[PDB]
Enzyme design. Structure first.
Site, short mmCIF file in Angstrom:
data_model
loop_
_atom_site.label_atom_id
_atom_site.label_comp_id
_atom_site.label_asym_id
_atom_site.label_seq_id
_atom_site.Cartn_x
_atom_site.Cartn_y
_atom_site.Cartn_z
N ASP A 181 -14.88 -24.94 -4.20
CA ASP A 181 -15.43 -25.44 -5.32
C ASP A 181 -16.82 -26.02 -5.14
OD1 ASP A 181 -13.08 -24.81 -6.64
OD2 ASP A 181 -12.98 -26.92 -7.54
N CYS A 215 -20.30 -12.88 -9.13
CA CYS A 215 -19.80 -14.02 -9.11
C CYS A 215 -19.70 -14.89 -10.65
CB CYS A 215 -20.47 -15.04 -8.15
SG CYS A 215 -22.13 -14.91 -7.73
N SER A 216 -20.48 -15.93 -10.61
CA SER A 216 -20.55 -16.54 -11.95
C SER A 216 -22.02 -15.90 -12.56
CB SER A 216 -20.36 -17.85 -11.93
OG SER A 216 -20.26 -18.20 -13.68
N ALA A 217 -22.99 -16.21 -11.87
CA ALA A 217 -24.53 -15.88 -12.18
C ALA A 217 -24.60 -14.36 -11.70
CB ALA A 217 -25.34 -16.92 -11.82
N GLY A 218 -24.21 -14.14 -10.41
CA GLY A 218 -24.35 -12.62 -9.72
C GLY A 218 -25.60 -12.88 -9.06
N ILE A 219 -26.05 -13.94 -8.43
CA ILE A 219 -27.02 -13.96 -7.42
C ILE A 219 -26.65 -14.79 -6.10
CG2 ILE A 219 -28.72 -13.79 -9.07
CD1 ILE A 219 -29.28 -16.98 -9.33
N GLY A 220 -25.70 -15.62 -6.24
CA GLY A 220 -25.61 -16.85 -4.90
C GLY A 220 -24.41 -16.25 -4.21
N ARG A 221 -23.42 -16.36 -4.49
CA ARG A 221 -22.09 -15.79 -3.41
C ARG A 221 -22.29 -14.02 -3.40
NH1 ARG A 221 -16.93 -18.96 -6.05
NH2 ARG A 221 -17.95 -21.07 -5.94
N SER A 222 -22.68 -13.49 -4.47
CA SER A 222 -23.03 -12.12 -4.62
C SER A 222 -24.09 -11.70 -3.73
CB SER A 222 -23.29 -11.76 -6.13
OG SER A 222 -22.41 -11.77 -6.95
N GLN A 262 -28.85 -18.94 -3.44
CA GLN A 262 -29.11 -20.15 -4.39
C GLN A 262 -29.32 -21.35 -3.72
OE1 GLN A 262 -25.73 -19.41 -7.46
NE2 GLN A 262 -27.06 -20.21 -8.84
#
Ligand SMILES: O=C1NC[C@H]2CCN(C(=O)OCc3ccccc3)CC[C@H]12
EC number: 3.1.3.48
Length: 284
Positions: A181, A215-222, A262
């Site tokens: 989290d 992921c949620s926004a598709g920029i960080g983990r992705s 991010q």
């Protein structure tokens, strides 16, 4: 400069925040005019995360071709990725249309449906074999075929049917379920084994359409997933793996989608991941 020595130098100097801001300053800025049209407001999860017009994936329909998704084409590595937001209640049908039209074999999911007590994406796949999903807006049927639950990830086999032509395909769903989290994982060992399992599947290979990553926004983990994959592939191809510059690869990838990586902790984790991955291929 051997990126591990670069790594120890930034750690000892505590300059990860400074390195990250420099990347933010140099990153490409391209127009996103289709994303901002009034008709597409409910197709975007976040007002500040939009695909560039030049690299956006187009849906094959005359009505509205828009989805929040980008094609990342890595020329030297010979790898392509589609990076997209977690689907919204009104874009689940669009999401599976894109998978079908782009001939993707794999979907990589790096988030939980619920995190920090809020919904980060719609429940877009069926949870029981006998309860299939029909998407009336795009004329697709989706069935759970099998599910394999492991400690750090779940793999699912799905059948996607084009109800128009009655063609069917097998899609592999790779679900990384243990990203914490807060912050990033302490060790990259479980993340690297997940990539290796995605590779092993064929999902990243040139005989298929590009892998769909979210992921949620598709920029960080992705961003972390495709950056680590591409850097490791270049190290196996280049005569001198020491020549692989993670900051330069990230800037190339940011020509195709804004905001990839991010936080300064996500940047350090990508380095850490790439450093530890190189020791299993080149070291022992
Ligand atoms: O858990 C594991 N034990 C043995 C390992 C064998 C394949 N793994 C690997 O090459 O290591 C990192 C990596 C992953 C992808 C690309 C380069 C390096 C993934 C982890 C595996």
């Amino acid at each position: 400069m051997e990126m591990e020595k670069e790594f120890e130098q930034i750690d000892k100097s505590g300059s990860w925040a400074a390195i990250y801001q420099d990347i933010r300053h140099e990153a490409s800025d391209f127009p996103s005019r289709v994303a901002k049209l009034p008709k597409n407001k409910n197709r975007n999860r976040y007002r500040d995360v939009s695909p560039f017009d030049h690299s956006r994936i187009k849906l094959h329909q005359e009505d509205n071709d828009y989805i929040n998704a980008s094609l990342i084409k890595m020329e030297e590595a010979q790898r392509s990725y589609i990076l997209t937001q977690g689907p919204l209640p009104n874009t689940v049908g669009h999401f599976w249309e894109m998978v079908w039209e782009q001939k993707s074999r794999g979907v990589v999911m790096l988030n939980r449906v619920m995190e920090k007590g809020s919904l980060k994406c719609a429940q877009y796949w069926p949870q029981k074999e006998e309860k299939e999903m029909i998407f009336e807006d795009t004329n697709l049927k989706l069935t759970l075929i099998s599910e394999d639950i492991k400690s750090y990830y779940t793999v699912r086999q799905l059948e996607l049917e084009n109800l128009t032509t009655q063609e069917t395909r097998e899609i592999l769903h790779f679900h990384y379920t243990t990203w914490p989290d807060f912050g990033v994982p302490e060790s990259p060992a479980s993340f690297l084994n997940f990539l290796f399992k995605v590779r092993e599947s064929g999902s990243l290979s040139p005989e298929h359409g590009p892998v769909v990553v979210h992921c949620s926004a598709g920029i960080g983990r992705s961003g972390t997933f495709c950056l680590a994959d591409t850097c490791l592939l270049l190290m196996d191809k280049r005569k001198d793996p020491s020549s692989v510059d993670i900051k330069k690869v990230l800037l190339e990838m940011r020509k195709f989608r804004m905001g990839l990586i991010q936080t300064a902790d996500q940047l350090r984790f990508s380095y850490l991941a790439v450093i530890e991955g190189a020791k299993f291929i080149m070291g022992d």
